[model samples]
Target: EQPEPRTRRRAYLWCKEFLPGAWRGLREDEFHISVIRGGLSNMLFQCSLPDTTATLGDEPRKVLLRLYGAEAMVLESVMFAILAERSLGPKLYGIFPQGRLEQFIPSRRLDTEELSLPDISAEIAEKMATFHGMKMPFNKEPKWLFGTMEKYLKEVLRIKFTEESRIKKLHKLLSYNLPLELENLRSLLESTPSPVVFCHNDCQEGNILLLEGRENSEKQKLMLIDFEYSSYNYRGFDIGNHFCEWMYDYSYEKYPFFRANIRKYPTKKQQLHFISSYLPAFQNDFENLSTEEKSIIKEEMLLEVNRFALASHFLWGLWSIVQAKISSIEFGYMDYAQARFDAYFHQKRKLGV
Candidate 1:
C-alpha cells in the first residue's frame, strides 16, 4: 500500500473526475484507502467513499485501484481493456498511465485441491479451451515461452547466491548447460506440432477465481484474472502449465510458504477428463464419432500436455532462479528452482528427450 498521502489523493481525484456519481462531493480525508493483498507482482488497493449521504444508482461505490509494479504497461492496460469489454475480465472504470481503477469483485481464488476436483477441472478445461479459441492482438509466433525463458536465463547467468549452499546448487544447475538444454527444448517443442493461441501464461490457482454466487452458470462460476503474463503461445503449453500448477499448494501457513506434491500431478483419467471437456468433438455428440476418433484426439492431447509439461518445468525453473536473486518476497526460490529443474530432467528422460 502506498502510505503516501499523494497516492490516496490521486485515487480521490481519479474517482471524482471519472466516477463523479458514486464518489461525488467527497473530500480527500472522506475517502477510504486500504491495501488488498494476494497478488505478488502488483500493489492493489481498495478505494471507496463511505457514502454518508447515499443515492440509489447503478454506479459502484468502490473500485480496485491497481498500481503498476512491472513491465509493458501499454500491452497490459490495452489487453485488460479488451478482456474487460469482452466480459472476460472485470470492468474497467478509469485509466491512467501509472495505474487504473477497475471493478472490485467479490470472489475467492481456487486452491490446489479444488483445481483437480472432477467438476472444477472440467469447468476449467471448458474455460481454457474457450479462451484458446479467441482471437487477440498478439502475434501468432508462439515466442512467449522460449523468449521469456531466454531472458530469465540471461539474468540467471549474471547473478550469484549469498550462501555456500545456494552457490553450490546454483552452479550445479548452471553446470547442466542451460543454453544447450534450452536449444534442445526449442528443437523438440518446435518440432512437435501444436496450435498457437492467445494464452494465460501463468494460469495458477492464484489467477483463477470462484465468484461468490450459487446462482451463476458453471461457465461463469470461475473467472480467470491477471493477464500480466498473457500472450500468444503453444496451446499445449497453457494446458501443460495448468497441469503442472496442480502440484503446488500456495495456501499454506508455514515458513517455506508452499508445498509441492509430485504425486498430485493429474492421472490418466484426469487428463482424459480434462481433454474430453476441452475438445469440441466430444461436446457435439457420441453417436456420430467413433471410439477410435475420440481415442486418437485424447491420446494426442495427453501427449501434448505431457511433452509441454516439461517446458513448464524448464520455464518456471529459470523464473524461480531470477526471482530468487531479485525478488524481496519471502519464499524458498533456490529449493523450488532445484525442484523444478529436477522435474525437468526427469521429464526429459521420461519423454525420450
Candidate 2:
C-alpha cells in the first residue's frame, strides 16, 4: 500500500528487504539506481550493484523495479508469473504490493519505423503465433472487450470536467452515438473468422524488446513484454492492435508526447507478409500447403485482422477517455481519445459497414 520514493535511498531499502542474498549488508552509498525509459503508465527504475562490486550467485546483480497502482493487481501478478515461467517475457525477481523487481535486460525497444523492417515483422508474427497458442489460467471467453468498454463508458460519464475547453470536448463526446456504434461493431465482428485466444492486448513496438547477446541467430530475437492489458480475447485483436501501433511513435518529445501518423499503417502487401508469417505457427500442416491454399488463408486473415482493428480503436478510445481523469501520466488523453474515435468512424466507412 506504500509508494516508495523514486530515489537511490528508497530503492536501496526495497532491495534490502526483497533482495537479500547478494545485497546483504551493502552500504547505502554502494547501491545504484537509475530510471528505465519508455513505459507510459508504469514507472521503471533499474537497480544494480556498482561496477566494481563483488561476485554473484543465485541472487541477481541487477533488477528492473516497476511502480504500479493496486488496480488489476491479481491479473497482472498472475500473468507475470506464467509469462516468466514460459520465457515469454522478462523474469520476475520479486513481486510485492507496491511493484515488482523484474529481470533487467540489456536491450532497446523497437521504434515505430523499425517495426516495419522485414526481419523484425516476421519475427514479431512468429512471436504472436506462439503467444496466441498459449493458455494462460484465466477466463477463456472474450468478455473483457465489451466489459471493459462498458466500465470505461460509466467512468467517462462520471467525470466532472472543470475546464471550459475539456468540458466542451466532453459534451461533444456525449453527442455521438457511442453505444450504437459499439453494438454495431459487435454484431459486425460476430460474423468474422476471429477466434478467442490468449492475447497480449498491448502489442506496440515499444513493448517488443530487441535484447543484447543474441548468439547471432536469426530466430528468437524479439521478446514481448507488458501484459497489463492482456487477456483471453479475439485472436484478431492482437494482430490488429499491433497494426494500429504502426501508426504511433511515443518517443516524440512534444506536447501530446506521442505522434500518430495514419499513413504508417501497414500496406496490404505488408499485411499479407506479416499474416503469412503468423499463420504457419498455429497450423499442423501449414508448411505442406500449396501456394494457392496459403494465399486464401492470408486473405482471410487480412480481413479478420482489419475488422478487429476497429475493435482496437474502440477499446483505446474508451481507454484514453477513462485515463483522462484517473491517470497522472502527461499524455493528452482527451485528444488521443478524440483521434481514436475519429479513426473508428473512418475505418468503419472504409469497411462499408
Candidate 3:
C-alpha cells in the first residue's frame, strides 16, 4: 500500500531538498515517483528526473529512495558509506534521517534458479570473498550473528501475545530446545577455524543485481545491494547463509507464498566447487596440484561450510521471528518464521549439534 498523501509529499520535499541545485527547480510532478516492490523489510521508491535532456551531464539521473527499517539505521548507514566508497553497491546519492537516495541500477534481481547456475554461483562466491577479505571500518568485536540473534529473540519473547494459537505455536517451537540448540551452535561456531571479516549477512538471490552489457563496456556486471544486515561476521556464516538461501523461493503468488525447496541444496561436490571458487588462488592453481592434495582441500572446505550452515539457519530463523512481530510487509511473516525454524531444527539435528 502507498503511504498517505502527506507522507508522499514529504518524500517529495526530502528528495528536492537533497538533490543538486540544478534539479531543485523541478516541480513535484516533474519528478517521476514509482514504488519498487520486492523489498520485504523497508519501503523503496524509484525517483527519476523526467527531463533527462536537461541534466547537467550525460549521467543517469534515476535514484532509489529507501525508508529505513525499524532498527539499526545508524549501523546500516555507516556500512552503506563503506560499501559505496568501495564501489561494491549502488552509489549513495543522499541520505535523510528516515532514509536515503541511492543510485538506481537498471538491472534484474537474481532468482533462486538463476543463482544456482555454476558460473553465476562462482562469480557470486568471488564477490563475497572480496568483501569478506576487506579490512572493515567498524570494530571487529561483538560479532553480528549471535549478538543480533539474541537481541531479536529477546524482543520476540517480550511481545505481548494476543493470539492464543500464535502463542501456542511459538511456545511449541521454543520447546524444541531452541535455546539450548542456539547456545550449542554458538559454541560450535566459536570453535570453528573460520576467520571473521566484513560480510553481507543476508546474501539471498533478491539482494543481488545483474546488469547486462547495455553500457559501452561489453562485460556484464553483478552487484550486491541492501546492506541492512551487513557487518563483520564469521566468514563461514556468509558462505553458509548464501548456500542456505538456495533452499527458499519467495516468488509464489498464493497464500504461504514462500516455499522451501530442500532438494535444491547444493551437493557435496557442488559445495566443494563453490568453496574452491570462493577462496583465491584455489581454482587458478588447481591444475598444478596433485589429486590427493585437491581431495584434501575439497574435504576440508566441505566440512567448514557444512558446519557453518547451522549458524545460517539460526540467524535467519531468529530474524524471521522478530519480523513476524515488527514488520509491516504483506507476506506471511509468521509462516515464514515457522519455516525458518523448521529448517533450523533439521539442520541442527543433521549436524549433530
Candidate 4:
C-alpha cells in the first residue's frame, strides 16, 4: 500500500496535531518528505514534529499517521488493534481518529522471487501458529470477518470488470457454486464450538511480518497485518486456507515434493515441529472431540477445499472467456485451478456421493 506525494507542510501539520512529538517547519524544501508506501484504503506517512528529535541519531525519527478511506472506518481498525494489544496480542502501535500509527519496526523485505518454497512455507506456518493460538474473542464473530472475502472479491471484480459480459459469466459460475461451498462452510461453522473467534482472514505473504531477534539470529517472530478481510470464522478455515495456499502450486494433487519440502524446509523434523507446536494447544480440545465429531469436521474441511478449488476454476474460466484474462498467456493457472476441481470430483467419487 503506497500513498501519493504530498507537501512537507501538509505532512508536518497532520503529524503534529494527530501524531504527538512530530517535526515542524516542513514548508522548507529540505523538509520536503512524502510517504512512500501506504495504500489507497488508508493514507499513511511518517513526519517529524517541532518538538520531536531523532533518538536513534542519524536515522530519521518520524511518527506514522494514517487517514482511513470512506469504506474503511478508523474506529474499527483502531479499536481492534487496541483490544488486541490490551490482550497481550503482538506488540502493535496505533494512533486514534486519524489512522493507525505503528512503531516502525524495520526488517528485510521478502523477495518472493528469491525466497525458496521451504522458507516461505515455514514462515507462513510460524505466522499461522501465532495468529490462530492468540487468545482473542471467541464468543462472537469479529466484525472484521463478516463479508470480508465478498468485499475483496468485488474489488477485484471491479478492477477486472471492464469486460462485463465475460466477468458476468464467471460470476455466474462462481455464484452457482457458492451455495455448495456455503453449505459446507455452514456445516463447519455449526460443528465448531460457538461462537467464532477473531482470525486474520488475509493470510497471504504480504500480510505477514517477520520480527527477527538481535540476540537470536535464527529466532523469528511473525506479525500479521491487513484486517480488511479479517473475521471470526471457523478456526479450521484459517489453517486449511493456509495449507491450500501452500499446496496450491500442485493444485489439489498435494504435490509430494511440496509436502516433503514443507517437512524439510523449516526443520529436519517437520512433522515433529508441527506436532510439538500445534498439538499441545489443540490436543486437549481435539482429544475431547467425539469420533463422529472428528469425522464431521474432516468432512466439512474437505467440502470447504472443494468449494474453494471449484470457485477458483469458475474464476479462471471467467477470466479466460472475458477480458483476455492473464491466464490466457499463463494457461498453467487454468490447469492448476481445474486440477483442484477435478481432485474434488475424485474425492466425491471416493465417498460414493
For every model in order, what is the number of clashing pairs?
0, 0, 0, 13
**C-alpha RMSD of candidate 3:** 3.5
For residue 130, model 4's alpha carbon misses the true position, in angstroms, by: 3.9
Which should have the higher lDDT, number 1 or number 4?
A: 1
Residue-level lDDT tens digits of model 1 in 265-327: 898899898888888622556436788988987888888888899889999999998888888
The whole-model C-alpha lDDT of candidate 1 against the native structure comes to 0.83
True-structure lDDT of candidate 2: 0.83
The 0-to-1 C-alpha lDDT of every candidate, in the order given, reads 0.83, 0.83, 0.75, 0.44
Question: In angstroms, how far off is 111's CA in candidate 4?
Answer: 6.0
Q: Residues 143-223, candidate 4, lDDT per residue (tens digit)?
A: 333244344334334545455554564554455364455345344344444224455654544555555563233435455
Query: Which digits, one per residue and each the tens of the lDDT, describe model 2 over residues 1-353?
Result: 22245556767878878885768767888887877643554677888887777746687888888876334688789888888999888888788777888899888788999889888898899998888989887899789887887787878888897878778877877678678778888888889978899988999987898878862558777888877888899999899989999987888888788787888889999998898788887775798999999988888888899999999998898888788778877888888888888777887888788
Worst window of 10 by summed lDDT in candidate 3: 212-221
TM-score of decoy 2: 0.90
Local accuracy of candidate 3 as per-residue lDDT tens digits, 253-342: 887778887778888767876777776532456657787887787777677777888777776776776766666666766677777777
* Residue 123 lDDT, candidate 2, scale 0-100: 89
For candidate 4, the 10 contiguous residues with the lowest summed lDDT are: 257-266
Full ranking by TM-score? 1, 2, 3, 4
